[PDB]
UniProtKB/Swiss-Prot annotation, chain B:
It is found in: Cytoplasm. CDD domains: RecA-like_PAN_like. PROSITE patterns: AAA (PS00674). GO terms for biological process: proteasome-mediated ubiquitin-dependent protein catabolic process; ubiquitin-dependent protein catabolic process. Component of the 19S proteasome regulatory particle complex. The 26S proteasome consists of a 20S core particle (CP) and two 19S regulatory subunits (RP). The regulatory particle is made of a lid composed of 9 subunits, a base containing 6 ATPases including PSMC2 and few additional components. Interacts with NDC80 and SQSTM1. Interacts with PAAF1. Interacts with TRIM5. The keyword Cytoplasm applies. Belongs to the AAA ATPase family. GO terms for cellular component: P-body; proteasome accessory complex; proteasome complex; proteasome regulatory particle, base subcomplex. Component of the 26S proteasome, a multiprotein complex involved in the ATP-dependent degradation of ubiquitinated proteins. This complex plays a key role in the maintenance of protein homeostasis by removing misfolded or damaged proteins, which could impair cellular functions, and by removing proteins whose functions are no longer required. Therefore, the proteasome participates in numerous cellular processes, including cell cycle progression, apoptosis, or DNA damage repair. The modification N6-acetyllysine is found at residues 79, 385. It comes from Rattus norvegicus. Its main location: cytoplasm. This is 26S proteasome regulatory subunit 7.
Length: 221, 396, 74, 51
């Protein structure tokens, strides 16, 4: 079977939601964990605490361990943290060495989310040690249309929003950013004395959420 | 010339010997302070001196699990970096020793007299924390576009949360604040808070930098818990470009504490988070080092670029200060504001200070129009100097 | 003889005492290659089995474990 | 023996007098033991043709 899945690329597409959704389908126990995060007080005492967590998550198969912010665990680099991070880092490599089989591959699944693909364990990059590794590209035309549709279900579906038309207008807005946009669209709507989110309402929400601000420098803006 | 010169040589030897004597001059006596009632006190103190069971050490239980064939032990860790077990000299119970709870234990019995409040981190931080603000828009540099945008986040969901809940949206509570220093980013956040009639608490990330490695995350977590407890409040994080800021994965510097703190902070926020009109603001005072994780839209709903007061907003705030002190009215401040580039509210108030001072030098007690001209020349140039070559950054 | 042993362990068992964690066991043979005092025993002047512990100061000790609860039980 | 000390091997020494009570056989890090036992492959160790 496939050993697991690796997710990398700029986030904001919903790397935490995605992990949660898949894990829900399966009814596999969902650990949201990150390697060095249970270090309490000193480095000595904290080494033990973090190592124990790593092992615990792998066990109780079947399971899905979700690793967030693996930049630190990865140690592509020539320096290490040499605290609790080292322990979690070694146990991962040993674990991947052991995983090749038919039998552990199904049972223990791993899903990971990290910002880049070049600050993960040097082994991971060597070969496909997790089957199918996915990069998420910049938002395609279909992607945009879909991020709008799901959100309109969440609030309400107006006759005014047209997903096909909407996708064209905007460029390069991902899932997270989009959620903020739908919340904003709603802000506009409440001012109007409406419950409906108008097509104009969605659009306007887009501008508030970015770096852009009212009363622009430009004389066309 | 000549007669004096010998007095010079001798005086130096004199001063050397005197430096030792100041110690004696202050007092030979070993005492600090003492009144007749600490004599009574002293008899009691003597026993405590006598016995090595006291003084009481401060220790902290990292986790509760132990209670191995004696009334509950737990692992309490003293600050000599050694772990010890507890016994009763008052009591011990699941509730007397907890996950965060600090304890008083003996040097040579290790028995608990008293538990102390959970963690060191929430008691110290309490002094730093100020309560409900009382500041207003005129003071920030007048009505600014950035001010109105804070109203949308703060005022609307707080005052009427019922509309956002019915509609199907979650309400927005987050803002990312960025720009150069002196804009009045905290000042603006506070300004909107007062009108809205909601509490404000400052949190400074730099003020708590109590470390033993990974310790820093436990502090972040505590500051967040405290904000959450106060409903209908705003929490503003100052100085979080470090410890809860940018990672260093290219490093060769022996750090992991900023990274550890970052890890915990992203995780708490991400997915969901239990809030109820707790507005989360982040202020980043560093353009050089930025934390991308926090910075992008999402759970933290909007980004606003914080810009210096517009031309009407700076004229208006200056007017208010100007009337208070002695100024000639018909004031040339307007001519200077228009002539000059964007000037912040902090900057204009320094004009008034500097103009007063030129006026004193001239030997008038009225600060005249001439004085304001010199004061603007000085301020505009000083602000202007800082560079960090922004084009270089745009390219990469 | 038993009551006398039993009271002495208890005086040892009462606080103060260090807490640490056991990273690994070894359990090496009793009587390595030596003779000194007392008798061949699990621990004494002659010690066989031990467990290595990593304490919270970042110091390591390999020590012999008491036979009331053995290193094999550890 | 005086062969129970050689560079890198474990020794137990008494605390109060720093004389050698015994030989302590060297620790074996579990990490090295994992590397010896495990084969990361799932492919033949005889041949792979053309390689």
């Amino acid at each position: 079977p496939p050993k697991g899945v690796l997710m990398y690329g700029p986030p904001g597409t919903g790397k935490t939601l995605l992990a949660r959704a898949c894990a829900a389908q399966t009814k596999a126990t969902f650990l949201k964990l990150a390697g060095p995060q249970l270090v309490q007080m000193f480095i000595g005492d904290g080494a033990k605490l973090v190592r124990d967590a790593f092992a615990l998550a792998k066990e109780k198969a079947p399971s899905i361990i979700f690793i967030d912010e693996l930049d630190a665990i990865g140690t592509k680099r020539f320096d290490s943290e040499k605290a609790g991070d080292r322990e979690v880092q070694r146990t991962m490599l040993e674990l991947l060495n052991q995983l090749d089989g038919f039998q552990p591959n199904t049972q223990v699944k791993v899903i990971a989310a990290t910002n880049r693909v070049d600050i993960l364990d040097p082994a991971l990059l060597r070969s496909g040690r997790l089957d199918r590794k996915i990069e998420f590209p910049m938002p395609n035309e279909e992607a945009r249309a879909r991020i709008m549709q799901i959100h309109s279900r969440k609030m309400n579906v107006s006759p005014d929003v047209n997903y096909e038309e909407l996708a064209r207008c905007t460029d390069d807005f991902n899932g997270a950013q989009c959620k903020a946009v739908c919340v904003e669209a709603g802000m506009i709507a409440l001012r109007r004395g409406a419950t409906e989110l108008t097509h104009e309402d969605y659009m306007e929400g887009i501008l508030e959420v970015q770096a852009k601000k009212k009363a622009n420098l430009q004389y066309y803006a | 010339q000549s007669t004096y010169s010998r007095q010079i040589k001798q005086v130096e030897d004199d001063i050397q010997q005197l430096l030792k004597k100041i110690n004696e001059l202050t007092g030979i006596k070993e005492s600090d302070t003492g009144l007749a009632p600490p004599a009574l006190w002293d008899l009691a103190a003597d026993k405590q001196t006598l016995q090595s069971e006291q003084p009481l050490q401060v220790a902290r239980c990292t986790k509760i699990i132990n209670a191995d064939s004696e009334d509950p032990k737990y692992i309490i860790n003293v600050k000599q970096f050694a772990k010890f077990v507890v016994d009763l000299s008052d009591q011990v119970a699941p509730t007397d020793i907890e996950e965060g709870m600090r304890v008083g234990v003996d040097r040579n019995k290790y028995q608990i007299h008293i538990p102390l409040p959970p963690k060191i981190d929430p008691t110290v931080t309490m002094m730093q924390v100020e309560e409900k603000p009382d500041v207003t828009y005129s003071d920030v540099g007048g009505c600014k576009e950035q001010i109105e945008k804070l109203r949308e986040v703060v005022e609307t969901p707080l005052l009427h949360p019922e509309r956002f809940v019915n509609l199907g949206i979650e309400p927005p509570k987050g803002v990312l604040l960025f720009g150069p220093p002196g804009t009045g980013k905290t000042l603006c956040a506070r300004a909107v808070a007062n009108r809205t009639d909601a509490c404000f608490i400052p949190v400074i990330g730099s003020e708590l930098v109590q470390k033993y490695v990974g310790e820093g995350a436990r502090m972040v977590r505590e500051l967040f818990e405290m904000a959450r407890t106060k409903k209908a409040c705003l929490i503003f994080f100052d100085e979080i470009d470090a410890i809860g800021g940018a990672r260093f994965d290219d490093g060769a510097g022996g750090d992991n504490e900023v990274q550890r703190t970052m890890l915990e902070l992203i995780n708490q926020l991400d997915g969901f988070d239990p809030r109820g009109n707790i507005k989360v603001l982040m202020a980043t005072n560093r353009p050089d080092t930025l934390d991308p994780a926090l910075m992008r839209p999402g759970r933290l709903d909007r980004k606003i670029e914080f810009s210096l007061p517009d031309l009407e907003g700076r004229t208006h705030i200056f007017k208010i200060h100007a009337r208070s002190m002695s100024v000639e009215r018909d004031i040339r401040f307007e001519l200077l504001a228009r002539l000059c580039p964007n000037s912040t509210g902090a900057e204009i108030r320094s004009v008034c200070t500097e103009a007063g001072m030129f006026a004193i030098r001239a030997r008038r007690k009225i600060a005249t129009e001439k004085d304001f001209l010199e004061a603007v020349n000085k301020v505009i140039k000083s602000y202007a100097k800082f560079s960090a070559t922004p084009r270089y950054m745009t390219y990469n | 003889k038993i009551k006398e042993n039993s009271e002495k362990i208890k005086v040892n068992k009462t606080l103060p005492y260090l807490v640490s964690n056991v990273i690994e066991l070894l359990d090496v043979d009793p009587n390595d290659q030596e003779e000194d005092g007392a008798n061949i025993d699990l621990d004494s002047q002659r010690k066989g089995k031990c467990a290595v512990i990593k304490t919270s100061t970042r110091q390591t000790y390999f020590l012999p474990v008491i036979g009331l609860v053995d290193a094999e039980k550890l | 023996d005086k062969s129970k000390l050689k560079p890198g091997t474990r020794v137990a020494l008494d605390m109060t007098t720093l004389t050698i009570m015994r030989y302590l056989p060297r620790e074996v890090d579990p990490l090295v033991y994992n590397m010896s036992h495990e084969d990361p492959g799932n492919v033949s160790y005889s041949e792979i043709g053309g390689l």
